[PDB]
């Protein structure tokens, strides 16, 4: 949860994301503490959208595991809500970051965007 170390990790994330505009992925400023799937202007996959509508909020403790396996995390979330029938299919332009500390750190960095 070292935000400054997270800035470096975020350079990897900038392959697809920016803070303040949509790109391959949605803009991330304000993502921490927000309902999943609700960055203005971005067209989410059914899986990323459906998870937010089922009550997924991007708290730090949700973003950190998500970043290791977006499809698995989202499906697990929906399945535990008894909504496995909304979890069919996969996310867009899927990226996985295995390193746990890098995930923790970049999530602290995301909180600095707003």
Which residues are annotated as part of the binding site?
Answer: 13, 16-17, 93
Judged by beta carbon distances under 5 to 8 A according to partner kind, the member of ligand HEC, ligand NH3, none in contact with residue 63 is: ligand HEC
Distance CA 1, CA 27 (A): 21
Q: How far is the CB of 66 from ligand NH3 (least distance, A)?
A: 8
Q: Does 95 bind ligand NH3 (CB under 6 A)?
A: yes
107 contacts: CB under 8 Å, gap ≥ 6: 1, 6, 32, 60, 63, 64, 67
Among 52, 70, 75, 108, which residue interacts with ligand NH3 (rule: CB under 6 A)? Answer: 70
């Amino acid at each position: 949860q070292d935000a400054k170390a997270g800035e470096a990790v975020f350079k990897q994330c900038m392959t697809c994301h920016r803070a303040d505009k949509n790109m391959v992925g949605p803009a991330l400023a304000g993502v921490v503490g927000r309902k999943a799937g609700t960055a203005a202007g971005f067209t989410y996959s059914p899986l990323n959208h459906n998870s937010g509508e089922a009550g997924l909020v991007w708290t730090a403790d949700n973003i950190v595991p998500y970043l290791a396996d977006p499809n698995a995390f989202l499906k697990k979330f929906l399945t535990e809500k008894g909504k496995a029938d909304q979890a069919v299919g996969v996310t867009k332009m899927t990226f996985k970051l295995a390193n746990e500390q890098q995930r923790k750190d970049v999530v602290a960095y995301l909180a600095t965007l707003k």
